[PDB]
Design a protein around this ligand. Structure first.
Ligand SMILES: CC(C)[C@H](Nc1ncnc2[nH]cc(C(=O)NC3CC3)c12)c1ccc2c(c1)S(=O)(=O)CCC2
Length: 168
């Protein structure tokens, strides 16, 4: 139903909340939930692990069948698969992992995938153990995405830092 609540409005199309993306998906029932995926769709840790465990491993089983016949994605690319019990669809987006040496310029391409969907629930791409500067990831989101994006950031200190930095 795309019924989002409790978000701060940063721009006319970008919203942010201190929340777990899994709990937001259960409450909102969005048309699209974004996963911060890797190229072979191995959802072991972080955001991808939280989403997969909330589907009771259905997301990993579907992702393994997709990779067996289609092979890996590219950095900056995306794949629409089922959203299972969390959303109508899951948009698996691969942002660059700068801690593993990948190019930060590809973060723009990663966010450009969001423009194919009118409204999305999403994490902050390439943050956490992917190592991108989170303030820079928020700036790329704001400058690239034109559709309605609801960012769930599950860390109060990081949320407060992002909001303070944006309001400078
Ligand atoms: C910056 C984080 C606060 C954020 N995490 C989250 N953000 C929003 N809903 C979440 N639910 C569980 C989370 C989660 O990370 N759960 C683990 C047990 C810690 C979580 C996040 C944002 C983007 C990325 C990652 C992590 S990652 O997985 O480290 C690498 C991929 C990019």
């Amino acid at each position: 139903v795309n019924s989002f609540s409790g978000y701060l409005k940063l721009t006319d199309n970008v919203y942010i909340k201190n929340a777990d993306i899994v709990e937001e998906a259960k409450k909102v029932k969005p048309t699209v939930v974004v996963n911060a995926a890797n190229v072979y769709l191995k959802h072991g840790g972080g955001v991808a692990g939280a989403l997969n465990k909330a589907t009771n491993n259905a997301m990993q089983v579907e992702s393994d069948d997709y990779i067996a016949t289609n092979g890996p994605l590219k950095v900056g690319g995306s794949c629409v698969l089922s959203g299972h019990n969390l959303a109508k669809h899951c948009l698996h987006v691969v942002g660059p992992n700068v801690n593993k040496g990948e190019d930060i310029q590809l973060l723009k391409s990663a966010y450009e995938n969001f423009n194919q969907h009118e409204v999305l629930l999403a994490p902050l791409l390439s943050a956490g153990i992917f190592g991108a500067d989170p303030i820079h990831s928020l700036r790329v989101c704001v400058d690239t995405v034109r559709t309605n994006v609801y960012l769930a950031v599950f860390d109060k200190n990081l949320y407060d830092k992002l909001v303070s930095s944006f309001l400078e």
